[PDB]
Write a protein that binds this ligand. Structure first.
Ligand SMILES: [Mg+2]
Ligand SMILES: [Zn+2]
Ligand SMILES: [Zn+2]
Ligand SMILES: [Zn+2]
Lengths: 901, 1098
């Protein structure tokens, strides 16, 4: 029975409409009287509404909240020019004629412009181009075609001033200052037939209305008054401006009636026009902004709408919301990836309204009986009539008994409820997801660690927001569309995003590395800890001394895999390609080689899984990592989201147990290189410095050959930088060579768990060359960065090359150079964030509302067909195989192995 | 030969004598001594409209810090009283006035022109020169450095602004218009004048002058300054044949003007278009007098010197046009001058004194016009005495220092003093900020210039948009104070330089500049600079004079101005340092002081200019023949907080920056007055400890007397995955024994306001009659006087001070002061005071115990930060084979990709120190080397690697790998989860938008911004978007007529809806909408915009 706004037609207002709309004429320039009691006819007249408690308005009455607010009006003594339509007024005046008010266009030109303007009038740009062409053709004319009168040129000034050069004696063309009255007379005589040629309709935009005669007064609610500490009742700046207008035009009316010299009348007219200009737009160019008592410009209507904190954006686009909470986040790997740990205190405050039905009457009755202080309780109860009651210890039993079908209970949060979890800034879609609730005692949100990469969150003080949907449709949408397990595959590149991080990968490597073996107790304990519902241990693999069974890590891992899974690939740990080549030959010869042969030719570097048995390989980042988790991707594509969730929840816990009970540490001796490596590194650095010095000497003698680089100095700098980069790379190569895989830091770097080789070579060999904006350090004194070097020195050390390492300590000059290097990265991030944010805002506003229709096409809001088939293929990038439309090889291999097996 | 230890002994005397806040105290003392008198002399006197009556200003003096009680007495005031009573520490300014009648002076009359705030511990403050016991009796911490103001009971500190050097020529490149521009910021009596001479593509020189709408030709304005003959301009510009050629080309292109009157009339036409003949000439002369190089002299006689300076600027421009000299980088600290407290205070005082003298003349004229000549001239003394209002000056000064908005557009000049701990306060007192806008990138400004070495800390800087624009002084910094310029000018004149006007700068001669203005020429620049250096080192002249010569351009620069940043250096002569061993011995024994070394010619200060000619040797053993100076202590180039990090050269720079920034947030016994102080917030750490591995600097600067952390036993291994992603695991038994346990203070304040008319508030137990009377349980522990009992338990929303306000916006409004809704604690102290106005003032502080829990943030000095991830029982913790149970466990994945080897070195050093019974030196570059620590650890029965064998807590069997374990210094930060948790179910709403309020204090709601809207759209959940946006905020219903679309106006009286504009009742529909949309429609209708709504049915 309700209606909805189907369309809005914007138009300009009219003085008659202003008169009819308003309910009072504000003539008294006073705001408030003693003890309130607003002055009748004042800027706070009760006719326009009531804001304070205890009083009623007259047009509609009711409380302050009940009154919607009503419009007033002020009848100006003499017309003034609206600021927003100033340029349009100027164009109209300099295009149309003065006598007949008709456009300075010929009849046939009018006819052809009529024909083209209707043709394809939908597009705005071509419409404006036609308008500009018509304006130019009208302006170029001198004598009006309809009447032989000289259309004198008209000039415009930024603060809405028009003073055309009226004909003077001897054709001097004196610049007569136009007044709004004669401009109004000019505009009224304009006919309506040619109005469309001026870009104006004849119904909601009349050129006469473009000049003000009576302006409205916003309702009192629209201009609220806030009481200060001493009851100042400081009103909105709009009220102060309105008071100024009322006083000024009152005095203007007085001196108009008195018939004073017209110069004072003109001065008051200018003052009133300036005041109205500030009221419409306080920042309008060409006028001095009207500051308040403390020298602050008033925020008039124009500034109220615009801006980040303005009305249009930041007030309807976004706003503060109810049923939300915010607190810090702490890790918890013992919950499922689609659950969030909620403090018990938040659950007592946030509530979910539940309707009492037949199947939940018992639970709701019990929870109402629990009251608002025990945890599984409620706060408010809503009867079928509509009135809302509050639960208290006095009326717990009575309210519990009165509960029946149709009532509503505002219960506490419970396990299994659905909530929204968000982290700011919200860069992509996955920044908001839906997790199930699990209540916890302490005061921080608990988030599973595999879910960090989507939120891009770290437990170093980050805070996150939680939202609780209240309506059933919202809950269903959150449960079906935004469940965590539904977003395992990223829509940006078609690969997994919710995968293992750090300890998961490292513990996987430790578990499935070659030579790892586990006893009976360890196997049983880790299997129970992971949650696998095993009942009998498999047959022992190797018997050690004293006759104790031992199980390889591969068997324990394979217990977690599906029964029918076959895949093989090369991971990051590969270093001997010959072993992988031999294994590939064995697999390719016949697609099901005998398992014993594969165990014979096993090698960490070629992961191979045969019917759920891990035959050869070590867990790496390529297994279930954040970026290229092949096994996780295969499971989530071939079995389902539930199976992927179970697999992740098992492997994370198993790897955590392995890394916790096997021991994993890093220390000061993780960078203790032997003597030979140090001697080699010193030799490399000395050779590089000698080469740089030779280049510098060659440049000084002038024998340097200019590279295609324009400047000889730039060629020298490029050569020096290339030499230094090569030196650092060679030092890194030797440092990496001399550190084995028994080192824990090397394990963490190679598997991709944390860091890279650059960190190792910078902590063990040397930092290298420091630079800003791609150039060596040059800012400082004349010809030298620091006063400790001779001027004109271009050597390696003198410009930033640091030959020391973090372990060996830095000399003070190297320390200063390194600080100069790091400051650039800091400021780079600081500026990059803002630039990227602005770009994303522009892109979002550009492409916000495109969608896929039911026929497969993508259409613009008006109806234009952007694409005849989305993505040229019709396949969602999220469901694509890493950007491919379909993985043919995988399907062929899977089917062939399935049937032939 | 000397060693770095001897240089350290010498260096520590510098901080022992000068202190750490001298840049404030010296500037303020100079201001008090001479700036007030200088400003008063600048103003001159009062000129009223009374016939044959004049007032001549005399001398101005400052009294002692006093307070005018509401009762007639005037009593001495102490800083603690000002802090507690919300007063303003200030002293009255007494100015004598000499009345001149008929050209005859009379006996001067002493008057009080107002009060001026007193910087604490300055030479005029009451705490100056007091012993420790006296300071303790007065209620102040002896370690307090002073150097800050107290305004309305709040501590305001003035941060130094970093401005361009004044009265100096800087040539820059403008490739967009291909113009080569030189700019000078001339300063005179606080007024600035940007005067620029530029050369465009045509090769014609134009001059830009303030208030002149368009550039004027160079020789036109040069002729306007007299000097009309073309040969005069040719000589002034220089004597280089290409320069003469270009000048003659300009003369040919500007032969229209040949008489000074013609040029004056021309500038009259430009500056005063379309006015009377006589007005434009006077306006042009006035603009020439006080807008073109005012610092050279505003008197009309000074045209010649201004023309000479303009010729010098033009010569610089054309020389850079030929590539002779390069562009001058603005970041070079030779071109930057710091604005200290004294300069800004003098500017503000001048601004206020202008208003004061204007009001004085207005009052005297009005009184004389109203009354008769007999009444005034009978007792001129009483007339002058009663024709003054000091509040005009006092309120201006107070408000400017309180809000921080300086007169002249500057903002943020004064900020609230931080008091979290020792480091935060002492670092805030040594901050330097840049006036540039933060939003723009400013890539060149934010970088680290090479001249910052020893003047600006390279690491301490903010993280966000302030990165690189906010900087802190290095430890070895010494800002200068100005000296009489005319005395230096006379000395230089006597040295042998010929004045400028006698002869032109022949390229065979050397130009000489004094504070940026040319003063003459000489033949041997090197001899002159050597002579001045010898005189400075002997002691003939002051040590603030700095001389630098530039061989390429043959210029000599002498600097004696204010605000230069300098560092000390040991003078090296003939490859032999002048500081010998017996000097170090004398310094150690106390027979010699730092000032004596300065006056003996052993150590001299160098600014960014003089350092251009230096070649400094970093270490004592590296001194060779060509070296001219020796670095005192390289470890002092770091700022005060940055020195906290031990072994800072073993860390990556971003981590050092993070640690330096975080050292200002840790809890600890910051000040001994925490019990009796009244601050808005404060923290106290129960058991602070001195770091085991510490730099020797912080013992000297006094940090070790106010430590801010504890020493933990840290093990590095992964435990249950609860310490992943920079989270830490903390032992439970250790927490229960008093580890990282802290307390939180917050002070509430209530005032018995005295409204006009006699209606005043009162303290009482509010009876249930009053409006706004909350629950009876809220006032349950208040005594009958309306104040809470100390050591009572409050839990949130509980009333602390009961107070009822008059009903004036037969009732009484309830205006009690209650605890914040989400907080809790125990009342600590209640103070009853009489405020400045004579009314009552009550301050209550509530303390809360804060045991560590999940979410509390911890951080180390090496930048590692994290929150507590899990609390583990002691029996579940692993234990080493020697019987050590870790206090805290960190994740091994945090070490690489953070690259903080300093943390591991400190871990080794802590256990070495604890085993050996002595603390370990960890100074920046002279600390104990790592290899020595490893060898010592090996000698004590432990592995050199620092690893140990532990057994698992649960299983009870030893781990396969040996684990790294040691002692590391950890600090508890003040970002604690008890102050960050926030929830909102329904709450109150705003007025205009009726949306949920903003802020935790007022039960506000969280923000659902535009980005969240786009995210929810991307998921495709339309109804969820509706629920989050509209359903739970600003629900509305509105009636609209179906032909106009104007909002239909319902009638409650007639029970009928209707269209007021349209007069329609046949069809009115009810539509749901948002309150924001309704208000937007109203706001559009406020303008002439008419939105017509078309309705449709679903
Ligand atoms: Mg973070
Ligand atoms: Zn109403
Ligand atoms: Zn006409
Ligand atoms: Zn209507």
């Amino acid at each position: 029975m309700k209606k909805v706004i189907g369309s809005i037609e914007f138009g300009i207002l009219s003085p008659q409409e202003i008169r009819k709309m308003s309910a009072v004429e504000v003539t008294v320039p006073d705001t408030y009287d003693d003890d309130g009691y607003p002055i009748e006819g004042g800027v706070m007249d009760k006719r326009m509404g009531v804001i304070d408690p205890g009083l009623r308005c007259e047009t509609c009455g009711g409380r302050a909240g009940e009154c919607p607010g009503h419009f007033g009006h002020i009848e100006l003594a003499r017309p003034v020019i609206h600021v927003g339509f100033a340029k349009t007024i100027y164009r109209i005046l300099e295009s149309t004629c003065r006598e007949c008010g008709r456009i300075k266009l010929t009849d046939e030109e009018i006819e052809e412009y009529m024909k083209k303007i209707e043709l394809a009038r939908n597009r705005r740009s071509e419409f404006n181009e036609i308008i500009k062409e018509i304006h130019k053709k009208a302006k170029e004319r001198m004598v009006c075609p309809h009447c032989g009168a000289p259309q004198y040129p008209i000039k415009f000034e930024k603060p809405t001033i028009y003073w055309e050069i009226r004909k003077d004696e001897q054709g001097n063309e004196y610049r007569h200052r136009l007044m709004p009255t004669e401009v109004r007379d000019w505009l009224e005589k304009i006919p309506d037939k040619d109005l469309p040629l001026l870009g104006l309709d004849p119904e909601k935009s009349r050129p006469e209305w473009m000049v003000l005669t009576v302006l409205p007064v916003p309702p009192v609610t629209a201009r609220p008054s806030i009481t200060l500490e001493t009851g100042i009742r400081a009103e909105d700046d709009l009220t102060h401006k309105l008071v100024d207008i009322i006083r000024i035009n009152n005095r203007l009316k007085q001196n108009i009636e008195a018939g004073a010299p017209q110069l004072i009348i003109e001065d008051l007219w200018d003052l009133l026009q300036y005041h109205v200009t500030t009221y419409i737009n306080n920042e309008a160019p060409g006028v001095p902004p009207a500051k308040h008592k403390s020298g602050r410009p008033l925020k008039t209507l124009a500034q109220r709408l615009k801006g980040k904190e303005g009305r249009f954006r930041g007030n309807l686009s976004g706003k503060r919301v109810n049923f939300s909470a915010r607190t810090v986040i702490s890790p918890d790997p013992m919950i499922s990836i689609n659950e969030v740990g909620v403090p018990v205190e938040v659950a007592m405050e946030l509530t979910v309204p539940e309707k009492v039905t037949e199947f939940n009457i018992e639970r709701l009755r019990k929870m109402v009986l629990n009251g608002p202080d025990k945890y599984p309780g409620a706060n408010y109860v809503i009867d079928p009539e509509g009135r809302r009651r509050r639960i208290m210890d006095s009326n717990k039993e009575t309210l519990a008994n009165q509960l029946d079908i149709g009532w509503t209970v505002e219960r506490h949060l419970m396990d299994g409820d659905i909530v929204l979890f968000n982290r700011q800034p919200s860069l992509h879609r996955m920044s908001i997801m839906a997790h199930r609730v699990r209540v916890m005692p302490y005061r921080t949100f608990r988030l599973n660690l595999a879910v960090c990469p989507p939120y891009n969150a770290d437990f170093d003080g980050d805070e996150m927001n939680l939202h609780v949907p209240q309506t059933e449709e919202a809950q269903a949408e959150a449960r079906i569309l935004m469940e965590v397990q539904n977003h395992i595959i990223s829509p940006r590149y078609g690969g997994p995003i919710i995968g293992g991080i750090q300890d998961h990968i490292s513990g996987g490597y430790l578990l499935t590395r070659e030579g790892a073996y586990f006893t009976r107790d360890e196997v049983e304990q880790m299997l129970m800890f992971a949650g696998v519902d095993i009942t009998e241990l498999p047959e022992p693999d190797k018997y050690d001394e004293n006759g104790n069974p031992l199980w390889s890590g591969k068997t324990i891992f394979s217990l977690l895999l599906p029964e029918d899974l076959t895949v093989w690939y090369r991971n990051k740990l590969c270093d001997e390609p010959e072993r992988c080549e031999a294994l590939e030959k064995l697999i390719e010869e016949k697609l099901m080689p005998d398992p014993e042969e594969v165990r014979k030719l096993a090698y960490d570097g070629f992961v191979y899984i045969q019917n759920g048995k891990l035959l050869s390989g070590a867990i790496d980042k390529k297994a279930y990592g954040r970026e290229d988790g092949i096994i996780l991707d295969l499971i989530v594509r071939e079995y389902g989201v539930e199976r992927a969730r179970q697999f992740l929840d098992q492997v994370t816990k198993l790897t955590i147990w392995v890394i916790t009970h096997k021991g994993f540490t890093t220390g000061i001796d993780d960078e203790d290189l032997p003597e030979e490596a140090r001697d080699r590194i010193r030799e490399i650095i000395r050779e590089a410095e000698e080469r740089v010095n030779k280049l510098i000497e060659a440049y000084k003698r002038g024998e340097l050959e200019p590279l295609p680089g324009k400047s000889l100095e730039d060629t020298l700098e490029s050569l020096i930088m290339a030499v230094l980069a090569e030196a650092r790379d060679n030092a890194g190569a030797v440092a990496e060579k001399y550190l084995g895989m028994d080192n824990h830091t090397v394990i963490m770097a190679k598997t991709g768990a944390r860091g890279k080789i650059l960190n190792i070579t910078q902590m063990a060999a040397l930092l290298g060359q420091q630079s800003i904006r791609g150039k060596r350090l040059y800012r400082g004194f004349r010809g030298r960065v620091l006063s400790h070097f001779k001027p004109g020195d271009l050597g390696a050390r003198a410009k930033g090359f640091v030959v020391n390492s973090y372990k060996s300590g830095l000399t003070p000059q190297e320390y200063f150079f390194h600080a100069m290097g790091g400051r650039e990265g800091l400021v780079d991030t600081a500026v990059r964030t803002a630039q990227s944010g602005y770009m994303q805002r522009r892109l979002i506003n550009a492409l916000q509302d495109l969608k896929v229709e039911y026929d497969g096409t993508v259409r613009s809001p008006e109806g234009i067909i952007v694409q005849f088939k989305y993505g040229e293929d019709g396949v969602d990038p999220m469901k694509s195989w890493r950007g491919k439309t379909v993985d043919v090889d995988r399907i062929i291999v899977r089917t062939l192995l399935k049937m032939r097996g | 030969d000397v060693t770095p230890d001897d240089l350290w002994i010498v260096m520590e005397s510098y901080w022992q004598e000068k202190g750490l806040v001298r840049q404030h105290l010296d500037s303020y003392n100079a201001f008090i001594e001479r700036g007030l008198q200088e400003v008063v002399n600048e103003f001159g006197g009062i000129k009223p409209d009374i016939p044959d009556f004049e007032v001549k200003f005399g001398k101005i003096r400052v009294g002692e810090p006093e307070f005018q009680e509401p009762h007639g007495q005037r009593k001495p005031l102490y800083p603690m009283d000002a802090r507690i009573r919300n007063l303003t520490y200030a002293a009255p300014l007494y100015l004598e006035m000499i009345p001149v009648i008929k050209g005859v002076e009379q006996d001067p009359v002493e008057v009080r022109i107002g009060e001026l705030p007193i910087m604490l511990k300055s030479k005029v403050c009451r705490l100056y020169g007091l012993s420790d016991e006296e300071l303790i009796k007065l209620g102040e911490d002896p370690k307090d450095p002073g150097g800050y103001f107290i305004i309305n009971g709040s501590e305001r500190v003035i941060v130094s602004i970093e401005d361009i050097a004044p009265n100096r020529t800087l040539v820059e490149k403008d490739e967009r218009q291909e113009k080569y521009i030189a700019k000078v910021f001339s300063y005179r009596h606080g007024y600035r004048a940007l005067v620029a001479v530029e050369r465009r593509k045509d090769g014609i020189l134009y001059v830009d002058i303030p208030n002149v709408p368009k550039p004027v030709k160079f020789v036109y304005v040069m002729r306007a300054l007299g000097l009309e003959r073309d040969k005069d301009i040719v000589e002034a510009v220089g004597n280089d044949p290409e320069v003469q050629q270009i000048m003659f080309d300009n003369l040919e292109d500007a032969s229209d003007i040949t008489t000074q009157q013609e040029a004056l009339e021309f500038i009259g036409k430009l500056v005063a278009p379309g006015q009377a003949r006589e007005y434009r000439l006077k306006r042009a002369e006035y603009v020439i007098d006080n807008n073109l190089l005012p610092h050279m002299g505003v008197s009309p006689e000074d045209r010649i010197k201004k023309a000479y300076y303009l010729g010098m600027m033009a010569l610089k421009v054309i020389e850079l046009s030929l590539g002779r000299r390069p562009e001058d980088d603005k970041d070079h600290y030779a071109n930057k001058r710091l604005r200290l407290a004294g300069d800004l205070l003098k500017d503000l005082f001048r601004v206020a004194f202008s208003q004061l003298v204007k009001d004085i003349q207005y009052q005297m004229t009005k009184t004389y016009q109203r009354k008769g000549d007999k009444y005034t001239f009978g007792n001129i003394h009483r007339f002058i005495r009663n024709s003054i209002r000091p509040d005009v000056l006092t309120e201006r000064i107070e408000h400017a220092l309180a809000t921080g908005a300086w007169p002249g557009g500057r903002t943020g000049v004064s900020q609230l003093l931080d008091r979290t701990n020792y480091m935060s306060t002492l670092s805030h007192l040594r901050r330097v900020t840049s006036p540039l806008d933060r939003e723009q990138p400013h890539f060149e400004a934010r970088d680290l210039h090479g001249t910052h070495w020893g003047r600006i800390c390279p690491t301490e800087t903010p993280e966000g948009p302030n990165c690189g624009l906010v900087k802190n002084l290095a430890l070895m910094a010494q800002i200068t104070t100005a000296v009489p310029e005319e005395e230096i000018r006379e000395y230089l004149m006597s040295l042998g330089i010929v004045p400028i006007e006698v002869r032109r700068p022949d390229p065979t001669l050397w130009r000489v500049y004094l504070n940026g203005v040319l003063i003459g020429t000489i033949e041997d620049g090197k001899a002159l600079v050597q002579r001045i250096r010898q005189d400075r080192r002997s002691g003939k002249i002051s040590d603030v004079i700095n001389v630098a010569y530039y061989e390429d351009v043959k210029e000599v620069y002498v600097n004696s101005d204010d605000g230069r940043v300098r560092r000390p250096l040991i003078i090296v002569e003939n490859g032999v340092p002048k500081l010998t061993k017996e000097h170090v011995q004398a310094v150690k024994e106390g027979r010699l002081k730092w000032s004596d070394l300065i006056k003996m010619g052993i150590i001299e200060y160098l600014d960014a200019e003089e350092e251009e000619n230096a070649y400094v040797a970093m270490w004592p053993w590296e001194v060779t023949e060509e070296h001219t100076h020796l670095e005192l202590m390289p470890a002092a180039i770091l700022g005060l907080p940055a020195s906290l990090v031990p072994y800072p050269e073993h860390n990556a720079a971003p981590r050092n920056t993070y640690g330096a920034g975080m050292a200002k947030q840790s809890l600890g016994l910051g000040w001994a007055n925490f019990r009796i102080r009244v601050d808005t917030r404060g923290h106290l750490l129960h058991y602070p400890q001195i770091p085991l591995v510490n730099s020797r600097i912080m013992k000297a600067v006094g940090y070790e007397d106010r430590p801010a952390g504890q020493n933990f036993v840290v093990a590095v291994l992964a435990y249950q995955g609860y310490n992943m992603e920079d989270a830490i695991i903390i032992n439970k038994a250790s927490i229960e024994r008093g580890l990282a346990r802290s307390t939180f203070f917050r002070t509430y304040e209530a005032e018995e306001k005295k409204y006009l008319g006699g209606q005043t508030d009162k303290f009482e137990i509010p009876d249930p009659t009053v409006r706004g009377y909350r629950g009876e349980k809220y006032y349950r522990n208040l005594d009958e006087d309306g104040l809470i009992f100390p050591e009572s338990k409050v839990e949130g929303k509980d009333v602390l001070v009961g107070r009822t306000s008059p009903p004036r916006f037969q009732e009484r409004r309830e205006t009690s002061v209650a605890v914040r809704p989400s907080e809790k604690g125990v009342v600590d102290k209640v103070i009853i005071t009489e405020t400045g106005d004579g009314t009552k003032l009550v301050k209550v502080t509530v303390r809360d115990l804060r045991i560590p829990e999940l979410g509390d943030k911890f951080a180390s000095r090496h930048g590692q930060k994290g929150v507590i991830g899990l609390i583990v029982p002691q029996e579940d913790m692993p234990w080493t084979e020697s019987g050590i149970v870790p206090d805290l466990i960190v994740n091994p994945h945090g070490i690489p990709s953070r690259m903080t080897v300093g943390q591991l070195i400190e871990a080794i050093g802590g256990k070495v120190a604890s085993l050996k019974g002595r603390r370990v030196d960890g100074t920046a570059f002279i600390g104990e080397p790592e290899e020595k620590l490893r060898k010592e650890l090996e000698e004590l029965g432990f592995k050199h690697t620092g690893r140990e064998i532990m057994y698992d807590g649960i299983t009870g069997k030893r781990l396969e790998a040996d684990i790294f374990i040691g002692v590391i210094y950890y600090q508890r930060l003040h970002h604690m989860v008890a102050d960050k948790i926030h929830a909102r179910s329904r709450g109150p709403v705003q007025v205009l938008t009726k949306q949920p309020t903003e802020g935790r204090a007022r039960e506000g709601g969280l923000r659902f911004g535009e980005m969240e809207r786009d995210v929810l759209v991307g998921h495709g959940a339309a109804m969820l978007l509706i629920e989050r946006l509209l359903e739970e905020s600003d629900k509305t219903e509105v009636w609209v007529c179906e032909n106009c679309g104007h909002i239909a106006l319902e009638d409650k009286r007639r029970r009928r809806v209707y269209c007021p504009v349209c007069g329609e009742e046949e069809r009115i529909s009810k539509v749901e909408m948002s309150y924001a949309f309704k208000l937007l429609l109203d706001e559009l209708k406020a303008m002439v915009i008419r939105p017509k709504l078309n309705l449709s049915e679903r």
